[PDB]
């Protein structure tokens, strides 16, 4: 769903880097795919894509499918990767990621 | 110190992938640099290189310098990366990584 608002080469490269089980690193991914330099406006747009049910949060089920937003046939994250990613972003410990928590994950 | 027993391109590619602060993932690295398919004999050789003082263990100070074994001017791992890496490998919880713990980190 971004393929068009991040460049295709960056996406490709970001996915190939984490093809192996447990090789995902969200900072590595965000840097390679090019989100880290994006405006807060574009980051909010990205958030909304990942929030598949538009609940206002990325719940754990959605985070597991994180890569599939970028390329539909991408692998699911392992449970291990998902928890690590949730724990880095979930600042208030409610077990989900809201928009400002996502912006911080991307940016800092 | 491997530049010669892993190929230069793989090393280069592995380092570029984790140039950003906190972007290191040891499974991603090991896969890209090509150690994961290596024999137990070559893995032991790699271990010995990383064990800079030849104590028989990679202590935390040595793990922080992990990348510098591959390319001398590579960055140090952050404290965050170092702890994560130590905690994935330190199976017996003595705070250092021995040869069989290293072989498991690489292989499985
Ligand atoms: Ca949601
Ligand atoms: Ca939260
Ligand atoms: Ca040592
Ligand atoms: Ca140990």
From Swiss-Prot, chains A, B:
Domain of life, source organism: Eukaryota
Alphabetized InterPro entries for the sequence: EF-hand-dom_pair, EF_Hand_1_Ca_BS, EF_hand_dom, Parvalbumin
Residues recorded with modification N-acetylalanine: 1
Keyword Nucleus found: no
Keyword DNA damage in annotation: no
Residues of the EF-hand domain: 38-73, 77-108
Keywords: Acetylation, Calcium, Metal-binding, Muscle protein, Repeat
GO cellular component terms, semicolon-separated: cytoplasm
Record SMART domains: EFh
Binding site for Ca(2+) 2: 90, 92, 94, 96, 101
Pfam family, one: EF-hand_7
Stated role: In muscle, parvalbumin is thought to be involved in relaxation after contraction. It binds two calcium ions.
Misc. comment: This parvalbumin has an isoelectric point of 4.25.
Family: Belongs to the parvalbumin family.
This protein's name: Parvalbumin beta
Annotated source species: Cyprinus carpio
